[PDB]
Amino acid sequence: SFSGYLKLTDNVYIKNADIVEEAKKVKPTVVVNAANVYLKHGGGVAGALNKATNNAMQVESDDYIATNGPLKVGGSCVLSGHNLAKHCLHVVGPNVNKGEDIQLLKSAYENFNQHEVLLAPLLSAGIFGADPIHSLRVCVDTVRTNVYLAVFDKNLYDKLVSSFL
Ligand SMILES: O=c1[nH]cnc2ccccc12
């Protein structure tokens, strides 16, 4: 199971880790991807997870989009986890660098409540432009299921833990 996580609340745990390496090690039932509405896994967590699947995540995603159209900002879809997890829950947090409503971050985290346990990144953090401290607060106040957060950046991880209310 998950190891080396710091317990933040009854159900939220956090670790300074590369989510790709964490997924390859644990092989969780669900790994969360920081997706965009088109499931175009170019950079950030999405690009890293997709590269770990040898682009199989992108091929599967393009077929999903061709059939279903784009996701909504705040929405999600369950696809294969390939070599990383049983499933990948592609969740679209608002990208404030693309001018999207930051209030949609709570709706994005609500998708996590459909899964008993997840390995996840902080939604809308990193290249999505939101304040990661705000993302962690929305996560703890929205997610009721067991969420194991992987924060890649050590300096950000330390700031998140030291500022956690
Ligand atoms: O951008 C990232 N690349 C690789 N691993 C991560 C783990 C957690 C959060 C962000 C990342």
Please tell me the distance between residue 129's alpha carbon and the centre of ligand 1 in angstroms.
14
Please tell me the distance between residue 10's alpha carbon and the centre of ligand 1 in angstroms.
24
Sequence spans of domains, the chain: 1-165
HSE (side-chain half, CA atoms, 13 Å) at 91: 30
β-pair partners for 31: 88, 119
Q: Which experimental method was this entry solved with?
A: X-ray
Resolution expressed in Å: 1.1
Tokens, residue 51 = 């590269």
Please choose from 18, 57, 127 the residue to mutate so as to test ligand 1's pocket, defined by most ligand atoms within 8 A of CB. Answer: 18
CB proximity list for 57: less than 8 A, separation 6 or greater: 33, 41, 49, 50, 79, 80, 82, 88
Given its phi and psi angles, is residue 142 left (phi above 0), alpha (psi -120 to 50 degrees) or beta?
alpha
